[PDB]
Amino acid sequence: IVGGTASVRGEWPWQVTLHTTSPTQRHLCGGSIIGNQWILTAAHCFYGVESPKILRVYSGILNQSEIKEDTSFFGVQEIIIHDQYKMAESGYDIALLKLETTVGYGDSQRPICLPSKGDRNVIYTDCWVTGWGYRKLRDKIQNTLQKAKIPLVTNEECQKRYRGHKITHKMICAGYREGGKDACKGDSGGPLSCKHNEVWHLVGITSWGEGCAQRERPGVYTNVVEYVDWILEKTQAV
Ligand SMILES: COC(=O)Nc1ccc2c(c1)NC(=O)C[C@@H](C)/C=C/C[C@H](NC(=O)c1c(F)cc(C)cc1F)c1nc-2c(Cl)[nH]1
Numbered sequence: 001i002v003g004g005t006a007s008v009r010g011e012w013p014w015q016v017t018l019h020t021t022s023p024t025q026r027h028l029c030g031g032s033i034i035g036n037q038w039i040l041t042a043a044h045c046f047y048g049v050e051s052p053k054i055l056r057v058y059s060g061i062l063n064q065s066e067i068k069e070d071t072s073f074f075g076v077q078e079i080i081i082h083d084q085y086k087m088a089e090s091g092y093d094i095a096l097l098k099l100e101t102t103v104g105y106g107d108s109q110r111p112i113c114l115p116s117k118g119d120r121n122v123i124y125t126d127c128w129v130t131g132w133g134y135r136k137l138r139d140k141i142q143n144t145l146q147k148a149k150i151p152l153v154t155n156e157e158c159q160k161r162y163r164g165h166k167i168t169h170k171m172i173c174a175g176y177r178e179g180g181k182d183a184c185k186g187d188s189g190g191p192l193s194c195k196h197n198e199v200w201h202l203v204g205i206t207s208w209g210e211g212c213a214q215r216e217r218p219g220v221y222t223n224v225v226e227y228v229d230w231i232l233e234k235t236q237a238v
Helices: 155-161 224-235
Strands: 015-020 026-035 038-041 055-058 074-081 095-099 127-131 146-149 171-174 191-196 199-208 219-223
Touching (some): 015 038, 026 199, 038 199, 038 224, 055 095, 199 224
Antiparallel strands (some): 015 026, 015 055, 026 038, 055 074, 074 095, 127 191, 191 199, 199 219
8 A cells, every 4th residue: 555554453354365375475465355254356366376275364464463374364265256357457357265164253354345236326435445565666565454545536537547448337446636545566356445324335356557656547446336246146156
């Protein structure tokens, strides 16, 4: 996160750190708890991941330093990548992780609501991008979960900013015209959480951008509202 501040413990209890153990253990991506055995993240996160056996999901984490060999985690039973996903810049950058065990809900870890299909008309004014990613282009993963309030940008306005790209309605952008506040390296897969009527909604999944927090380059996110039926298809399967 560029231009953010440290989060308080329990501030984003749906936020997870997804680690890979190959070759050595390290933070890979962010993610969101959306159900007791489900993590919603970006599909680009699994480039080169051949097995879910190398993945560890950590919930209830404020600081990366809370993670040691003795720290409990959730194994991943299955990686579900959207069928139409080719690359982040083309969209369909969405994946579900099916956990081997059930998450026990508490004040440190609980799910975020998905947006309502009746809420694609609502204008979200209180949006936050969270993650342990870099604070500048050449940096390291942050210890403490960072947060930044970012305004949502219309598709028309985001498409002007990305001449050469096709910004679809399955993408949602956010950023200040002058930059300074955004997602950066290591934040991908994490949530874009918007508070509406005192309830947090998972509006986006951190996907891509041109650099980090640049003027007239809003961060591009997976527009979660457009995938509610796909999420339900995969999570509510008979
Ligand atoms: C000690 O542990 C570490 O150092 N781990 C660590 C550090 C950095 C990154 C990691 C893991 N993940 C990966 O390399 C996984 C791959 C498959 C993801 C690539 C795209 C992703 N990109 C982003 O996070 C991203 C955005 F989502 C939006 C915007 C606007 C800008 C961005 F850079 C991104 N994440 C990182 C980097 Cl360089 N680029």
